[PDB]
Amino acid sequence: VKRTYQPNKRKHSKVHGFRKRMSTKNGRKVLARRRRKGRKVLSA
Amino acid sequence: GYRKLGRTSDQRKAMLRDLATSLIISERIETTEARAKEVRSVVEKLITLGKKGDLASRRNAAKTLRNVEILNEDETTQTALQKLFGEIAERYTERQGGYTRILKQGPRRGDGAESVIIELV
Amino acid sequence: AVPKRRTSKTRKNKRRTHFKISVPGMTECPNCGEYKLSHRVCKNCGSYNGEEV
């Protein structure tokens, strides 16, 4: 059996990272709700 | 089939050969009850080969003993086959049977095993 | 298969009437002057006294 999380340092940043949030417009609404709710970590 | 021990009929043959050749050396060992109600039935059939002193019996005893080596004869080697036919088989040359005894120590800690001490009489 | 009822405190304490340990069966080691378990050697100084061990 082969599970559903095969970790990678590059695809984790090229997809969920900071500069892929600020790329589009709806990423800047995601980052507008995680520094509003008061999270410690904005972007994984 | 004298008495099984929880070993798989192949280990019990090569377990008694690890208690016999370490009892002619140390002259006493500390072990469980049922591991030493059977090794009195082996090492007393093996000093009997010591009282003969043949050529057949120096070979026919070697198939139930290991080949270990002893150092302190004041720095002279003595294989465990040669410790018998020797200082063991000459101490008992006028005692017909009954070479061992079993002294019950106590239950050991954390296993509940009735420990005994076997020693050559 | 599961229990059908909750077994009570009367039925529980009855079932462990026979759940206990027995006395060791001691002696008096007559040379040192202690207690030892019979047919065994002494853990202190002590002879077997039929064997002097």
Place this chain on the structure above:
Amino acid sequence: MEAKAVARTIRIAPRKVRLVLDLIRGKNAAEAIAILKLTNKASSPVIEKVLMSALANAEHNYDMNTDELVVKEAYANEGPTLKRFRPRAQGRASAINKRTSHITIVVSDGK
């Protein structure tokens, strides 16, 4: 006149202790030291080490002799648990209750 020595929160269970404390109750103190040194259970040296504190706090600081002492009461109460888990099959988990106990030995001298 009577003494005691309470040991509390010992790592052992509370039902496996009171089989051994059941065995020595109402007996002479000279024997009961040497019954706990012949039984092969797990709570015998623990109970023994606290019986030899009710036999040293009855000779020191009350100044009574340790040849006449008798165990009046000896009882094991219950102390707080330590809930740890055990990962069990098909994504479940069962709770394992490691219990602790309080042990109290009280000696006497018939007065």
Place this chain on the structure above:
RNA sequence: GAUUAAGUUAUUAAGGGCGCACGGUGGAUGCCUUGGCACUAGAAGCCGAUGAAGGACGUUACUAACGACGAUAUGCUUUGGG
């Protein structure tokens, strides 16, 4: 207290039941407030290319975290209160 029969009623407690006494675990209730919520009156309603809101890394004699601070860093200069 037996000599024989006939006939009666007990004591036992391995353990259990009810009452009382004395202990442990457990954190309900009682009594408090550092924190909240709901609203009146006066202010007030913008900061950012002279680099913002939010941040990572750093700073003490010895610093793990929050506090306040930025290689002039657990603070510096000056005008007033005390």
Place this chain on the structure above:
RNA sequence: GACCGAUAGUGAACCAGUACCGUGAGGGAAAGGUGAAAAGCACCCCGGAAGGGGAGUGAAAUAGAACCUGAAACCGUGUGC
């Protein structure tokens, strides 16, 4: 303030959007109280140490950091019928 008083009132009185769960957007609890003053148990004794019992501080430690009061369930030891 004819509003709440630690399962209440904010999710949050404890260094909270934090442990922790999710690849991701996102979900999210648990926590409070020694005494008026730390005067927080010097020294002896059993112990390998824990934990105890005396002596001491205190109005009280049967308030010793499992720290105010301490209910029931549930586990104990004793005794009259």
Place this chain on the structure above:
RNA sequence: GUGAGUAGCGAAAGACGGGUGAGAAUCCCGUCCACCGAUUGACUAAGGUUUCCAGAGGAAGGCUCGUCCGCUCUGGGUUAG
């Protein structure tokens, strides 16, 4: 709490002599014995982020025990034309 001191303890060869210790079938050293050997052996990517190493620890974690440790305290460890 009852179920209950019941079901389990996660493939598999250990035996003894010596030390150590308050404590040893389990820790360390020795001899004999068995098991893999197109691998249970030897180097590097992916991923994890101090685990590696020496000195002290035994409350918790380890399906038992423990003097032991991939767990706790102190002090160290990664060198390029």
Place this chain on the structure above:
RNA sequence: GUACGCGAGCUGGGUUCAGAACGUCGUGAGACGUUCGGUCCCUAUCCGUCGUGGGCGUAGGAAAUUUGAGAGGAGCUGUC
């Protein structure tokens, strides 16, 4: 007759699941006679049953040997 006795004793061939094909009916999605394939779960608390031990009672305490109140078992039959 006993849940057409008995699946916390066994079987799952069958009947009644998702796939597929024929005949036929339906303009259509699909449907009622045959066909090939198709996961059968549980650590026994109480009554019941089969075994086998402690406690106390039978007016003193013990070693053996027995009467049988009652209750079980057995009961078939060919050929020369």
Place this chain on the structure above:
RNA sequence: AAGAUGAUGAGGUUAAUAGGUUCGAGGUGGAAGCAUGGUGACAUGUGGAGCUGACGAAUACUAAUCGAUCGAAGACUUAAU
């Protein structure tokens, strides 16, 4: 000789209950070493040989040691003696 454990039964120094030991019965079917034959494989003779777990006898050489706990004193009433 009985058996899941407890029970039943054979024994505890006045001792044959197990182990060893010396004798057998059953089982296998010619041990090793040397001597002879042959180029060697192997064959013959010393020898119904040697090895032999559970069944039958024999002898205290080894272990059943020293010891401990429970266990009677015989109720009353009425007709017989």
